[PDB]
Design an enzyme around this catalytic site. Structure first.
Site, PDB file in Angstrom:
ATOM      1  N   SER A  42       0.803  -1.202  -0.071  1.00  0.00           N
ATOM      2  CA  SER A  42      -0.131  -0.091   0.019  1.00  0.00           C
ATOM      3  C   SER A  42       0.790   1.452   0.023  1.00  0.00           C
ATOM      4  O   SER A  42       0.252   2.558   0.065  1.00  0.00           O
ATOM      5  CB  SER A  42      -0.967  -0.005   1.129  1.00  0.00           C
ATOM      6  OG  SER A  42      -1.997  -0.659   0.711  1.00  0.00           O
ATOM      7  N   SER A 100      -5.318   3.541   4.684  1.00  0.00           N
ATOM      8  CA  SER A 100      -4.862   2.624   3.629  1.00  0.00           C
ATOM      9  C   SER A 100      -6.167   2.146   2.645  1.00  0.00           C
ATOM     10  O   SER A 100      -6.194   0.984   2.360  1.00  0.00           O
ATOM     11  CB  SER A 100      -3.708   1.397   4.172  1.00  0.00           C
ATOM     12  OG  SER A 100      -3.058   0.759   3.186  1.00  0.00           O
ATOM     13  N   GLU A 140      -5.886  -1.885  -6.780  1.00  0.00           N
ATOM     14  CA  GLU A 140      -6.282  -2.925  -5.600  1.00  0.00           C
ATOM     15  C   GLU A 140      -7.356  -3.957  -6.000  1.00  0.00           C
ATOM     16  O   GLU A 140      -8.149  -3.572  -6.712  1.00  0.00           O
ATOM     17  CB  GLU A 140      -6.892  -2.195  -4.580  1.00  0.00           C
ATOM     18  CG  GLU A 140      -5.555  -1.491  -3.798  1.00  0.00           C
ATOM     19  CD  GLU A 140      -4.838  -2.149  -2.755  1.00  0.00           C
ATOM     20  OE1 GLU A 140      -5.033  -3.283  -2.774  1.00  0.00           O
ATOM     21  OE2 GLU A 140      -4.283  -1.538  -1.868  1.00  0.00           O
ATOM     22  N   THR A 209       2.446   3.107   5.534  1.00  0.00           N
ATOM     23  CA  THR A 209       2.837   1.887   5.625  1.00  0.00           C
ATOM     24  C   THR A 209       2.169   0.662   4.254  1.00  0.00           C
ATOM     25  O   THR A 209       1.658   1.248   3.438  1.00  0.00           O
ATOM     26  CB  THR A 209       2.030   1.267   6.939  1.00  0.00           C
ATOM     27  OG1 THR A 209       0.477   1.362   6.618  1.00  0.00           O
ATOM     28  CG2 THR A 209       2.511   1.878   8.111  1.00  0.00           C
ATOM     29  N   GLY A 210       2.771  -0.385   4.471  1.00  0.00           N
ATOM     30  CA  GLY A 210       2.380  -1.195   3.295  1.00  0.00           C
ATOM     31  C   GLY A 210       2.602  -2.671   3.928  1.00  0.00           C
ATOM     32  O   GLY A 210       3.236  -2.754   4.849  1.00  0.00           O
ATOM     33  N   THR A 211       1.596  -3.540   3.565  1.00  0.00           N
ATOM     34  CA  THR A 211       1.590  -4.953   4.143  1.00  0.00           C
ATOM     35  C   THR A 211       1.316  -5.842   2.945  1.00  0.00           C
ATOM     36  O   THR A 211       0.638  -5.515   2.081  1.00  0.00           O
ATOM     37  CB  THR A 211       0.627  -4.812   5.448  1.00  0.00           C
ATOM     38  OG1 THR A 211       0.936  -3.920   6.269  1.00  0.00           O
ATOM     39  CG2 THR A 211       0.669  -6.356   6.073  1.00  0.00           C
TER      40      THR A 211
HETATM   41  O1  LIG Z   1      -7.071  -4.946   0.258  1.00  0.00           O
HETATM   42  C1  LIG Z   1      -6.223  -5.777   0.305  1.00  0.00           C
HETATM   43  O2  LIG Z   1      -6.713  -6.978   0.297  1.00  0.00           O
HETATM   44  C2  LIG Z   1      -4.641  -5.480   0.123  1.00  0.00           C
HETATM   45  C3  LIG Z   1      -3.928  -6.446   0.912  1.00  0.00           C
HETATM   46  S1  LIG Z   1      -2.335  -6.272   1.237  1.00  0.00           S
HETATM   47  C4  LIG Z   1      -2.251  -4.778   2.550  1.00  0.00           C
HETATM   48  C5  LIG Z   1      -3.224  -5.279   3.819  1.00  0.00           C
HETATM   49  C6  LIG Z   1      -3.063  -6.031   4.488  1.00  0.00           C
HETATM   50  C7  LIG Z   1      -3.360  -5.693   5.771  1.00  0.00           C
HETATM   51  C8  LIG Z   1      -3.928  -6.616   6.827  1.00  0.00           C
HETATM   52  C9  LIG Z   1      -5.105  -5.985   7.879  1.00  0.00           C
HETATM   53  S2  LIG Z   1      -5.431  -4.312   7.657  1.00  0.00           S
HETATM   54  C10 LIG Z   1      -4.696  -3.555   6.592  1.00  0.00           C
HETATM   55  N1  LIG Z   1      -4.280  -4.669   5.380  1.00  0.00           N
HETATM   56  N2  LIG Z   1      -3.437  -4.004   4.502  1.00  0.00           N
HETATM   57  C11 LIG Z   1      -2.427  -3.717   1.946  1.00  0.00           C
HETATM   58  C12 LIG Z   1      -1.492  -2.576   1.901  1.00  0.00           C
HETATM   59  O3  LIG Z   1      -0.388  -2.743   2.455  1.00  0.00           O
HETATM   60  C13 LIG Z   1      -3.269  -3.566   0.556  1.00  0.00           C
HETATM   61  N3  LIG Z   1      -4.648  -4.056   0.610  1.00  0.00           N
END
Ligand SMILES: O=C(O)[C@@H]1CS[C@H]([C@H]2C[C@@H]3CCSCN3N2)[C@@H](CO)CN1
Length: 265
Positions: A42, A100, A140, A209-211
């Site tokens: 993200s 995010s 996304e 952040t990004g995840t």
């Molecule tokens: O909408 C989605 O499925 C994705 C999954 S990864 C990651 C997710 C993964 C994390 C887990 C819980 S809440 C915030 N979420 N952000 C996000 C960005 O770093 C992007 N959104």
């Protein structure tokens, strides 16, 4: 030795870690795997918002965007609550950075427009900042599905650091748009256990952040010392060794940031 500390952390979390802090004042650049590619996850939402601010008058913020069920395709904590009334461009920027919000990100990409649902123009925006490395190839949630090593939807700690530096400390944006971007990243709700956790309380920290899958966890930040000296800090990581289901580990980024903060103090 800093490279030694970063290596220790990689072993602790069974991780690949990337760190960049641009050189500034009399402080040398900090760099570790800084030119290797890491998934955006993200983090792209912050320069996305810059792209949309650059492209329009500030009055554009008040334009109402409507959307509905088949637009909500990803994690979208804010957009899911306002789907019945719609959201302004401003509200969408707010949500994309502070929560995010994925649907907000897609709607902002669409606002930018052009091929690839906006992703080409997002990339072109980075190129205008001299970033020849980064690429956004999908929106996304598809941008999260690239496997380890895949070059799609990646940046590098070095590339995104220099981008964020121009956005927040440099003159990529006029002052009023710059403040909006800066303020949104300051008010980020997702970053408390990452770069913010590695710096003393009397330092100011703003971030996005990004995840991801494969244990991906990123944070890109601008920090200000107590005497107002700014540094850009980019930290990216994955734990691909544990496969698609490997848990992201925020503590890795917090420890990496602690090592950086000790060097910048
Ligand atoms: O909408 C989605 O499925 C994705 C999954 S990864 C990651 C997710 C993964 C994390 C887990 C819980 S809440 C915030 N979420 N952000 C996000 C960005 O770093 C992007 N959104």
């Amino acid at each position: 030795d800093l490279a030694d500390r970063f290596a220790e952390l990689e072993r602790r979390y069974d991780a690949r870690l990337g760190v960049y802090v641009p050189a500034t004042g009399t402080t040398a650049a900090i760099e570790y795997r800084a030119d290797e590619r890491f998934a955006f996850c993200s983090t792209f939402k912050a320069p996305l918002v810059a792209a949309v601010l650059h492209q329009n008058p500030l009055t554009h913020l008040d334009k109402l965007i409507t959307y509905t069920s088949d637009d909500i395709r990803s994690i979208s904590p804010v957009a899911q609550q306002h789907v019945q009334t719609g959201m302004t461009i401003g509200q969408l920027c707010d949500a994309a950075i502070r929560y995010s919000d994925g649907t907000a990100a897609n709607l902002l990409l669409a606002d930018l427009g052009g091929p690839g649902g906006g992703t080409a123009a997002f990339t072109g925006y980075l190129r205008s900042l001299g970033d020849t490395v980064s690429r956004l190839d999908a929106e996304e949630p598809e941008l999260n599905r690239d496997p380890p090593g895949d070059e799609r939807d990646t940046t590098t700690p070095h590339a995104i650091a220099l981008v964020l530096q121009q956005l927040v400390l440099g003159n990529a944006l006029p002052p009023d748009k710059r403040a909006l971007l800066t303020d949104w990243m300051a008010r980020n709700t997702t970053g408390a256990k990452r770069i913010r956790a590695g710096f003393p309380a009397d330092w100011k920290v703003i971030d996005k952040t990004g995840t991801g899958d494969y244990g991906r966890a990123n944070d890109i930040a601008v920090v200000w010392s107590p005497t107002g000296v700014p540094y850009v800090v980019a930290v990216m990581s994955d734990r691909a060794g544990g496969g698609y289901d490997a848990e992201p580990r925020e503590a890795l980024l917090a420890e990496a940031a602690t090592c950086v903060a000790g060097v910048l103090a």
